[PDB]
Ligand binder design. Structure first.
Ligand SMILES: Cc1cc2nc3c(=O)[nH]c(=O)nc-3n(C[C@H](O)[C@H](O)[C@H](O)COP(=O)(O)OP(=O)(O)OC[C@H]3O[C@@H](n4cnc5c(N)ncnc54)[C@H](O)[C@@H]3O)c2cc1C
Ligand SMILES: Cc1cc2nc3c(=O)[nH]c(=O)nc-3n(C[C@H](O)[C@H](O)[C@H](O)COP(=O)(O)OP(=O)(O)OC[C@H]3O[C@@H](n4cnc5c(N)ncnc54)[C@H](O)[C@@H]3O)c2cc1C
Ligand SMILES: CCCCCCCCCCCCO[C@@H]1O[C@H](CO)[C@@H](O[C@H]2O[C@H](CO)[C@@H](O)[C@H](O)[C@H]2O)[C@H](O)[C@H]1O
Ligand SMILES: CCCCCCCCCCCCO[C@@H]1O[C@H](CO)[C@@H](O[C@H]2O[C@H](CO)[C@@H](O)[C@H](O)[C@H]2O)[C@H](O)[C@H]1O
Ligand SMILES: CCCCCCCCCCC1=C(C)C(=O)C(OC)=C(OC)C1=O
Ligand SMILES: CCCCCCCCCCC1=C(C)C(=O)C(OC)=C(OC)C1=O
Ligand SMILES: [S]
Ligand SMILES: [S]
Ligand SMILES: [S]
Ligand SMILES: [S]
Ligand SMILES: [S]
Ligand SMILES: [S]
Lengths: 421, 421
């Protein structure tokens, strides 16, 4: 309302949860902050692959949101938005109720575009997903069924995927778990299928020796790897794969039987957001400026996977660059800062800063991680790390982030670089 | 004088030059700041190996100090201190003149302890040094003499050395330059001799895959490598080497003819500092507390290679951990802050922060670099990088640091991490 702006955060994920806390902290008691999300629980998504192989469980990585945000004076509505009317500034929820906003911050993350590959939906066939805890649990269930009746395994990443690390991680921990159960020899074939132009390209033209290290990794586990692939369909428990060369010319088609599979899907924007006229690009990602403000609606901001970021390269099979946590948090920070500025008469000048990608993968005893920035080469930082210390770092960070999500954020969040001072 | 403390910085190196600027900035016009150093010029020491192979020249990496510090109101005396009387607080210069201080900040760096290995002094035989520009020029001169009359090459690091990166860098660029001149095949043998327990230990138990990468590097250049070595003497143009196993038992002695050689020497504290009663450990390194304050004299502080840092491991042949630039600068910052606090009645609480090592080596087209912290494993960061981007980074940093040394520092110096914002 006038004099007392009502700010709505859509989506309680890696960007949205911090956003709700940071917004309430920035605005204070004279403004209503409302968090709206499709689930009543937060989940730490980097841990989903471990759930998918049975090394973690839901209770380890997920917790109900309501109590934690509400003790901070944030209103919480555990309902999916089905429609957004940007003219009236009304959000229609799944139950038919509608919520008005003065400012809207979209943090709705990815729509998992299984429809791109007919039959690839986890409820449609043997190719599963570890992108969410619901899917990871379903993946583990199918993994156990594999254990009862061993057959070919196929793991990898679809055309248009942008999040490749988890495919490599999952393949490695599946290989590892299989050996631990004394079952690895019962698997007739173990194949890795990716849209990357080469192993370890990772949607970012590689980082450090990611190519050499990931290639060696898969070879060590006896995993046969194919790049420049797209899957045209999953059908009759078979994966239909088309492989091209650099020039896009088909060099072979394959038909792979799949007893147990997991392919990272391509991401699009969620339908309620994509469905806002003039808001998004054709992929359904919010078109924003450097201040995280929508190009069309001055009072709509966005952060996280939901925003559109232009590609800097094009690969034989379409792939995308990932949007990762440190950069997501810089977007959230900018958006919060600039909404507050707006509320006080100014155009906020804060930006996301420099593009970067950071990822951590834990194989059990040892981890792998990378930092790349900026997006185009030659970079200012381009580093790949491996070792026990990396595993310890992931474990520590998960523990930290989950606690922060329960306790609340102020907060120039990454003061977790104080490990220097 | 009372009410107007006189602060003296001893040594105009990587720590001392920033220190003089930062001290004057912190204290202002009501206090005299005096910089005293053995040379009238600053040199960028990471570039010395390139001077040693003729890829850089003195004028590229060195410049006269006087004009630059004096325009900042800093007094400059281009004279070695020969004696320090900590009771009277008088420094006796080489010319007999004496300078009084109220606070003294020691930044005198290393004494190159050639005397540990009889015959190893650069003016005594064929084993040269690239630790200073004077030595690097002399090394290049001897390199050209090698070119006229090819013979065995021996490069590496003495027992007690703590700065290993430059030995690897120098060996690599020497190998590289030799091929460029079409002369590499004229060299009968090319040997790398180190006190490290293994190749790429680097006085810090390795970092990232430093062992694998450096081993492969030397092998590619046809350089034969020997670890766990100490040199007992250089004589008759031969290097006498003793090699032990893990337990310190001699497994062989070698006698290597040397036409052209370069061995990183062990570091001690400079004689004027070591000679202060109760100031230093037996190595001649200043015993300081966490605030960079001398344990004995409340008004003596120290930073850089000059301070004593306890070892965390012991290797078959004694080696030390390096003291590198980012940590040196944190020491300088702490010392400046705490001297100012003292001047204003308080005990400053600022510390060096977390131990870390950072190094950059440039091989011409591509660089190598590492970050390790803290000192003991498992670390929080333990990363090794290689590539063209690393070469570009070194070139950029050298250019930046030299400019800053001419323009002056305020300054939370490493805001050069703003490449993020
Ligand atoms: C398996 C996997 C591993 C990853 N590992 C890393 C890593 O090691 N490091 C790193 O920095 N990044 C990692 N990421 C990438 C990234 O950081 C995450 O995907 C992160 O969760 C994205 O944050 P987000 O806020 O944009 O989207 P999300 O975290 O997916 O949150 C989006 C949210 O909004 C909701 N929502 C969607 N539609 C609606 C609607 N119509 N109405 C209401 N709510 C809605 C969701 O239910 C959800 O809570 C990983 C991603 C995956 C899939
Ligand atoms: C070949 C080489 C390569 C290196 N590369 C790197 C790198 O890539 N990254 C990194 O972080 N570090 C690097 N270092 C390590 C380190 O950072 C440097 O050695 C650095 O110069 C040390 O700073 P300092 O102020 O302690 O000593 P120095 O820079 O040696 O300065 C000491 C100074 O005080 C003086 N002095 C000595 N005695 C007296 C006296 N009695 N009276 C007056 N003045 C005196 C000197 O003449 C000199 O100016 C390298 C070192 C070497 C030798
Ligand atoms: C987070 C994003 C990244 C993608 C997800 C994960 C990818 C899968 C990881 C495969 C790694 C397997 O292969 C592993 O790699 C490294 C090579 O650097 C080797 O390790 C080597 O370098 C490391 C340091 O980095 C040293 O500590 C080690 O002593 C050395 O042998 C391991 O001996 C090998 O077992
Ligand atoms: C600064 C402190 C370090 C010590 C000083 C310098 C040590 C000497 C460097 C020797 C390196 C030589 O060997 C070189 O190493 C790397 C291995 O990671 C290889 O490079 C490999 O990883 C890099 C990324 O890190 C990739 O970009 C590259 O495509 C891949 O092949 C090079 O193909 C090889 O030529
Ligand atoms: C120098 C520029 C890069 C700074 C990044 C520092 C690394 C800190 C942890 C990285 C991380 C982030 C940010 C993160 O958001 C995240 O969750 C999605 C992780 O997974 C466990 C991470 O490992
Ligand atoms: C995360 C903790 C480590 C931070 C270090 C950031 C790297 C910036 C440059 C490093 C560097 C420093 C500090 C430095 O002082 C120095 O000169 C001795 C270099 O040689 C060229 C360097 O490459
Ligand atoms: S990734
Ligand atoms: S590439
Ligand atoms: S990631
Ligand atoms: S080093
Ligand atoms: S070690
Ligand atoms: S270094």
């Amino acid at each position: 309302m006038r004099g007392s702006a009502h700010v709505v955060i859509l989506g309680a994920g890696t960007g949205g949860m911090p956003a709700a806390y940071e917004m309430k902290e920035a605005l204070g008691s004279g403004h209503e902050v409302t968090l709206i999300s499709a689930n009543d629980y937060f989940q730490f998504v980097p841990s989903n692959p471990w759930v998918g192989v049975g090394w973690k469980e839901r209770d380890d990585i997920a917790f109900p949101i309501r109590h934690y945000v509400e003790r901070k004076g944030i209103h919480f509505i555990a309902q999916s938005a089905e429609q957004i009317d940007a003219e009236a500034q009304n959000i229609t929820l799944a139950d038919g109720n509608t919520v008005h906003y003065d400012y809207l911050m979209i943090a709705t993350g990815p729509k998992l575009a299984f429809e791109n590959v007919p039959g690839s939906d986890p409820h449609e066939g043997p190719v599963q997903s570890i992108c969410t805890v619901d899917h990871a649990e379903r993946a583990f269930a199918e993994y156990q069924a594999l254990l009862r009746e061993p057959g070919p395994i196929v793991i990898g990443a679809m055309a248009g995927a942008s999040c490749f690390g988890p495919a490599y991680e999952y393949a490695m921990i599946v290989a590892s778990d299989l050996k631990k159960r004394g079952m690895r020899d019962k698997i007739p074939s173990f194949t890795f299928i990716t849209s990357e132009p080469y192993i370890g390209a990772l949607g970012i033209q590689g980082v450090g020796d990611s190519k050499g290290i990931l290639t060696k990794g898969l070879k060590e586990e006896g995993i046969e790897a194919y790049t420049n692939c797209k899957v045209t369909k999953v059908e009759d428990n078979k994966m239909y794969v088309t492989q091209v060369d650099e020039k896009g010319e088909t060099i072979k088609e394959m038909v792979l039987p799949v007893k147990f599979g997991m392919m990272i899907p391509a991401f699009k924007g969620v339908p309620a957001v994509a469905g806002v006229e003039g808001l998004c690009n054709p992929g359904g990602f919010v078109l924003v400026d450097e201040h995280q403000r929508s190009k069309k609606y001055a009072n709509i901001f966005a952060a996280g996977i939901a925003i559109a970021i232009p590609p800097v390269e094009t690969t034989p099979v379409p792939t995308g660059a990932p949007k990762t946590g440190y950069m997501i948090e810089s977007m959230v920070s900018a958006a919060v800062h600039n909404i507050k500025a707006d509320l006080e008469g100014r155009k906020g000048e804060q930006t996301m800063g420099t593009w970067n990608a950071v990822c951590f993968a834990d194989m059990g005893d040892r981890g792998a991680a990378f930092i790349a920035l900026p997006q185009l080469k030659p970079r200012k930082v381009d580093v790949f790390a491996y070792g026990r210390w990396v595993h310890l770092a992931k474990v520590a960070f998960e523990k930290y982030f989950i606690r922060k999500m329960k306790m609340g954020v102020s907060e120039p969040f990454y003061e977790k670089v104080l490990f220097k001072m």
